[PDB]
């Protein structure tokens, strides 16, 4: 389908980015395999909504 990862900018915490483009930690999580806020600026973290 189609992929949108994104670099951790300002907003470098889990809860803030999430709700920031819109994306549930749920969800986000799922395809990052990421337990917990463990992020930072520069971090690659897919994001991608839609299916």
Known sequence: ???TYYTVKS???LNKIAAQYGVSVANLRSWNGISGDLIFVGQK???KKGS
């Open 1 to 3: 389908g189609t992929n």
């Open 11 to 13: 907003g470098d915490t």
């Open 45 to 47: 973290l897919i994001v």
